[PDB]
C-alpha cells in the first residue's frame, strides 16, 4: 500500500536551507520515501524497546477505577464526575511551532498511534521524532541543494540526492541500510 506524504514539510525545510532552490517531483518522492523509512525504523525500534521494558504508570484511568472501588455509590458517582470535569478542563484549555518545527508533531502522533507501535504514546516522542525527521531532512536537502548549485541548476533532481547521500559517509551508511 501507500505511506504518508511528508512532501509539504520537505518543501518547507527545503525553503529554509536553500530558499531559491527548487525540487523536482521524483526527487520529492525520494525524500518522502526517506522520511517514511526513517519513521518506520525509529518507530519500530522504539516500539521494540517499549514492549521489552514496561514501567508502571499511574494515569487518570487507574485513579478513576480505584475511586470507583473505594468510594460508596453516590459519592463515587459525583467524585468521578468532578474528576472528569477537572481533566477535561485541564485539556480543552501550535505544537510544532511550540517546538519550533516545520514537521507536524500532531501528525507524527496520530501515526505513532495508528501504526500500533504501542498501546500508549507519550508526549515529546512526536516532538523528538519529528525533530529528528526534520533534522535529517534538513541535512539531506542542504547537501543535495549544494550539489544542485555546484552542478549549476536551479532545482534538486534525484541525481543530486544520489550525489549528496553517496558522498557523505554517515548519510550513505544510514540510507544504504
Amino acid at each position: 500500500s501507500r505511506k504518508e506524504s511528508y512532501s509539504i514539510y520537505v518543501y518547507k525545510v527545503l525553503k529554509q536551507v536553500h530558499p531559491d532552490t527548487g525540487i523536482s517531483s521524483k526527487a520529492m518522492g525520494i525524500m518522502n520515501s526517506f522520511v517514511n523509512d526513517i519513521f518506520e525504523r525509529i518507530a519500530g525500534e522504539a516500539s521494540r524497546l517499549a514492549h521489552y521494558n514496561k514501567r508502571s504508570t499511574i494515569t487518570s484511568r487507574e485513579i478513576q477505577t480505584a475511586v470507583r472501588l473505594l468510594l460508596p455509590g453516590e459519592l463515587a458517582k459525583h467524585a468521578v464526575s468532578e474528576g472528569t470535569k477537572a481533566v477535561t478542563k485541564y485539556t480543552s484549555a501550535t505544537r510544532s511551532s511550540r517546538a519550533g518545527l516545520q514537521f507536524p508533531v500532531g501528525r507524527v502522533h496520530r501515526l505513532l498511534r495508528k501504526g500500533n507501535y504501542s498501546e500508549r504514546v507519550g508526549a515529546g516522542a512526536p516532538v523528538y521524532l519529528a525533530a529528528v525527521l526534520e533534522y535529517l531532512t534538513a541535512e539531506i536537502l542542504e547537501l543535495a541543494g549544494n550539489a544542485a548549485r555546484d552542478n549549476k541548476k536551479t532545482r534538486i533532481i534525484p541525481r543530486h540526492l544520489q550525489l549528496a547521500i553517496r558522498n557523505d559517509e554517515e548519510l550513505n551508511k544510514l540510507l544504504g541500510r
Binding site: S24, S25, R155
Partner: peptide
C-alpha cells in the same frame, strides 16, 4: 520530471 509545488 516536473517541478514540485504545493497544492490544495
Amino acid at each position: 520530471d516536473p517541478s514540485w509545488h504545493p497544492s490544495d
